[PDB]
Structure 1
Amino acid sequence: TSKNPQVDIAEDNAFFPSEYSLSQYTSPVSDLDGVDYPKPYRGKHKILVIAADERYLPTDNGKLFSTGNHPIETLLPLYHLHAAGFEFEVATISGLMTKFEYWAMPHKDEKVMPFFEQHKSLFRNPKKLADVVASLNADSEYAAIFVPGGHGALIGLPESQDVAAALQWAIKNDRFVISLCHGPAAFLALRHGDNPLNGYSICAFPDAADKQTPEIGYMPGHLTWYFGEELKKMGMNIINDDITGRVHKDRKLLTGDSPFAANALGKLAAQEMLAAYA
């Protein structure tokens, strides 16, 4: 199994992660489980998902990493939440369709795939974040904001005033905020302004790992910046410097360190949210 990045002919000088990377970090079936919720939430609040509308990430050598939102990271936690009784809505800054890292799609998962198929339109024809934000008030029916990981979360989200307003609303209004892997990079939207996440702790994909993955061809080059240290400059605490599939809780801020943490984050979020709404 080669460690060389693979060609994405759709774009100019763009690559998918190497075969080795894929054999070691993806699988045709997920580790989705523990989906037992006999007493589901019966209210109206939904999960607001802020997804990636861009697939290509430029690396330090000019090459583009063909990324986007991680399917395992996005789907598992929503599967648990949907099962727990929480439906979801999807939004992107531009309003353009969600861009997934399909090379990580568990195409043979007899549960995840049909769940994906039955909500495909929500991802394909998302709402424009700004439109959602304009209607926000203390009574808005969103029980939580979910920012899934995938390197696509590094594009736009970390510098969007819309994401900032959104996060500000959620925190100020005592709502849940869920994220994993690189999803917390969006929290950087709060720099230069009121930062209600100051002093919060989370786990996430460590910058240290991003400096190693290209060695195995997960990406065609190095990142041009690291969200970990920036978040630390923004007054946030990152508790891990490695990948173990762990999850963490700081009040209503629920996070995960990687796709290996997706199933666990689902359980944690479902458990925490059910208890709050019942």
Structure 2
Amino acid sequence: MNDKHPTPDPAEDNAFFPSAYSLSQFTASKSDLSGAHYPTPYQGGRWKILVVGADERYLMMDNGTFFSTGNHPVETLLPMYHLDKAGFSFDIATLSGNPVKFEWWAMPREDQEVNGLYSKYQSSFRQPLKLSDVIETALGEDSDYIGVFIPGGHGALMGLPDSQEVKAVLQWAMKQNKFIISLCHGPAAFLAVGDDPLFAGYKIVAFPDEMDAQTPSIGYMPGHLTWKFGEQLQAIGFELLNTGISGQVFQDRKMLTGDSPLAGNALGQLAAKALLAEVEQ
């Protein structure tokens, strides 16, 4: 209950879920989903959003242990919920084609709506598209994709940050003036552009590095991140606006971002309003 020791994961050797204690403070049986009401949604049947998810669950800490993480279910499904009520479909992909990995210990087991939306897309989450395929066939200048969504969760720190494919997707999004939606640790994917001065000047909100440096103190993670995504993003032009977290979000042109596992709902509202305004015109 009050136990702060990391909790061992039976599936992997030397891997741990967050501590029972960190779990009682950072996870809840229900989400704060609300406002997903769009009286006049898009009904074109065309525009859909491409979801790029984490495909690995075990993240290596600075002490040799594995953090049992992945994408955050609340951060992932709340935004998808709003966009769904808005009238948008989703295509789900990972770098390897392997199943999308969620931090189930963060899933609100009592949220009917959140579990409802998930049931609807489980087949896609569990049998995703291989990103390389989406790139070779579903992008270009006349894509049915109106935006790209990269959910948070430390699982977003593996693969995506230095992937040549994610880079093509981002470059496409920026070149075809498409919406890029992310929150928490999701912006780490942006580092994929490597040395491209593509995002120079952009303003985003993202989980604060200083907080990652503190969470292990209560056994949230079995150790510390081997690097800090926040400084890297900054290194390539991004202006991180938030010093702390509050579930806030920001829009810089078509770049929409949330600051933490508290920003899901707000992001879903923002993306919804921004996209509905894009298409209703």
Misfit runs of 4+, over 2 Å: none
Amino acid of the structure 2 residue aligned with 1:227: F
Asked whether 1:167 is paired with 2:170, we answer: yes
1:204 to 2:206 alignment:
yes
The answer as to 2:141 corresponding to 1:142 is no
How far is 1:87 from its partner? 1.0
Q: Distance in 1 between matches of 2:279 and 2:3?
A: 48
Query: Which range is displaced more, 38-47 or 76-85?
Result: 38-47
Contact 1:207 1:241 in 2 (8 A): no
Query: Aligned partner of 1:266: which letter?
Result: G
- Map 1:89-104 onto structure 2 (within 5 A): 89-104=91-106
* Residues 8-19 of structure 1: pairs in structure 2 closer than 5 A: 8-19=9-20
Alignment counterpart, residue 188 of structure 2, candidates 164, 185, 205: 185
Q: What residue number does 2:219 align with?
A: 217
Shift of 1:243: 1.1
Please, what TM-score do these two structures have when normalized by structure 1?
0.98
What is the aligned partner in structure 1 of residue 130 from structure 2? Answer: 128
Give structure 2 stretches of 5+ with no counterpart.
Answer: none
SS at match of 1:65: strand
Structure 2 SS opposite 1:255:
strand
Query: What CA distance in whole angstroms lies between the structure 2 residues aligned with 1:195 and 1:157?
Result: 18
Is the counterpart of residue 110 in structure 1 residue 112 in structure 2?
Answer: yes
CA distance in 1, matches of 2:275, 2:203: 19
Contact 1:14–1:66, Cα closer than 8 Å, also in 2: yes
Instruction: Give the letter aligned to residue 143 of structure 2.
Output: S
CA distance in 1, matches of 2:108, 2:197: 37
Deviates more, 1:220-229 or 1:231-240: 231-240
Q: How high is the TM-score relative to the length of structure 2?
A: 0.97
SS in 1 for 2:191: helix
Cα shift readout 1:16-67 (whole Å, capped 9, x = no counterpart): 0011211111111110001110100122111100000000000000000000
How much does 1:3 deviate? 1.2
Secondary structure (helix, strand or coil) at the match of 2:217 reads: helix
- How far is 1:196 from its partner? 2.2
Q: Is the 8 A contact 1:172 1:196 kept in 2?
A: no
Q: AA paired with 1:87?
A: S
- Give the Å deviation of 1:195: 3.9
- Following TM superposition, by how much is the alpha carbon of 1:86 offset from its aligned partner in structure 2, in angstroms? 0.7
Question: Aligned partners of 2:129 and 2:225: how far apart in 1?
Answer: 29
Q: Deviations over 1:123-174 (max 9, x none)?
A: 0110111111112211111111000000000000001000000011011101
1:72 to 37, 54, 74: 74
Identical-pair percentage: 60
Cα distance in 1 between the residues matched to 2:141 and 2:197? 18
The unaligned stretches of length 5 or more in structure 1 are none
Aligned equivalents of 1:160 and 1:241: distance in 2?
A: 28
- Say yes or no: does 1:34 pair with 2:35: yes
Would you say the 8 A contact 1:168–1:195 is kept in 2? no
CA distance in 2, matches of 1:45, 1:197: 25
Letter in 1 for 2:72: H
What is the rounded CA distance, in whole Å, between the counterparts of 2:200 and 2:51 in structure 1? 22
Aligned residues: CA RMSD: 0.8
Residue-by-residue CA offset, 1:43-99 (whole Å, 9 max, x unaligned) = 211110000000000000000000000000000000000111011110000000000
Aligned to 1:271: 273
Matched to 1:165, the amino acid is: A
Letter in 1 for 2:19: S
Secondary structure of the 1:31 match is coil
Cα distance in 1 between the residues matched to 2:266 and 2:260: 10
Name the counterpart of 1:5: 6
Select the residue among 254, 257, 262 that pairs with 1:260.
262
